[PDB]
Glycosyltransferase (Nicotiana benthamiana), 455 residues
Amino acid sequence: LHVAIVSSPGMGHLIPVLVLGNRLATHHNIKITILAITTTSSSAETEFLKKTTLTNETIEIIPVPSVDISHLINSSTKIFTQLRLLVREALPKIHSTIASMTHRPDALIVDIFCTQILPIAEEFNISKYTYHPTTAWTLALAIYCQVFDKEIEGEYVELKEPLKIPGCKALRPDDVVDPLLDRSDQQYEEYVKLGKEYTDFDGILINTWEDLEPETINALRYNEKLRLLLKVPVFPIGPLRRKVETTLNDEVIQWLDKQNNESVLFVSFGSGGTLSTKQMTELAWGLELSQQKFVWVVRPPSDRDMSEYLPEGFLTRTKDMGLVVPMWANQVEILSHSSVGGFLTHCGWNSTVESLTNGVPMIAWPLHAEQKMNAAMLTEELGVAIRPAVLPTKKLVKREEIQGMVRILMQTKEGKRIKEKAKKLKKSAENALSDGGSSYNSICELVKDIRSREL
Ligand SMILES: O=c1ccn([C@@H]2O[C@H](COP(=O)(O)OP(=O)(O)O[C@H]3O[C@H](CO)[C@@H](O)[C@H](O)[C@H]3F)[C@@H](O)[C@H]2O)c(=O)[nH]1
Ligand SMILES: COc1cc2ccc(=O)oc2cc1O
């Protein structure tokens, strides 16, 4: 079989598509080709294309150029809509690239943002699926959002009662996805539109697994009110993640090698994440006062060398206790290391999966997208994370609170209890993605669905 997987422009959307491609190719002998939509501008992932042009197995990458869209955006236009327009205007280029395909794919594939390709899948009459690369809960939200639109008048964020998704958990108004923060903003309309677009596909892949969200998945499958909207299968195929590159002369890993087991706290706010000047200074102090060992991936604050935004003397005072790394670090290789025993994270789903597959517990610190609905899940339901009393996005987290949180996770028995839960999650994830595992079984049902359309 041939499948073509379509990726959106940023690295954060490319890598998950690659991991899916690699998984299918290796474990299911299905020839794959990734149509990666590029920015045709920044292109800080186009060099990764060069790096990947070298070891292709299947694993055939086709770059697709975008246009310059500065004419359709404005300082105030938000990222969600940005992505939406980029693809929207890339549509013709996709149409052309699939035409002039050497062997036709037999099956199309869309990332959350590349849903507007459905048109060109129906033309040429090819099997079409979407990849929702985070929680089942957020999927349920997206789909049922079209109903909420009509049921609620006024702004979601001001409600005194939680939002009740048929079958799934109750969503507290504060923990809503970014699109639902303001209904007057175009991203909201795009969001509800996305929710509707999902249902039009022949099936929806989700990088979770049954044991993680049993009720929510069962709701998607069987809840009457929801099934009035959905009407097609769901495929929990996760948790999928990057492979480890057992690394040699990386000084972070060499530092970590000199530390004790589960004694280091990794701090990272994902690709793109940045704090305020005040928040960053309070964080810095928190880590110092904790007297705990850490690796801190730092970028400039939002509201240069990484010492002007840091407390004077910090680096010399924290020498031998912490390790401050600029912009990027090898997260997967860190998290897999024996000496890492905690993760202060923004709760991006890839970060979370990388942490849970490793049995590392977390300090949830949600910033954007659905990170608030993931933080909620991790802390409340799953019990593998702790969080500040008030959301960080609403109020400044001061040094005392931080230093406690870090203390509570890397010293106290409560911390160890949380860790033990994360290990259980790890094991359950392993059992799936294993032969006989529900997630593995989910692809086998996917491949069955694909072959059925071909005959
Ligand atoms: O210093 C670094 C920083 C990142 N990475 C890697 O980049 C990826 C980041 O994805 P992740 O889900 O963790 O966060 P991010 O893309 O920043 O945030 C959104 O990710 C998605 C995009 O909106 C969204 O689904 C999610 O809700 C958001 F959180 C992930 O594979 C990390 O391992 C790294 O190796 N080192
Ligand atoms: C780029 O910012 C994003 C925001 C959202 C919001 C809701 C959601 O389900 O997915 C997202 C994925 C993103 O990549």
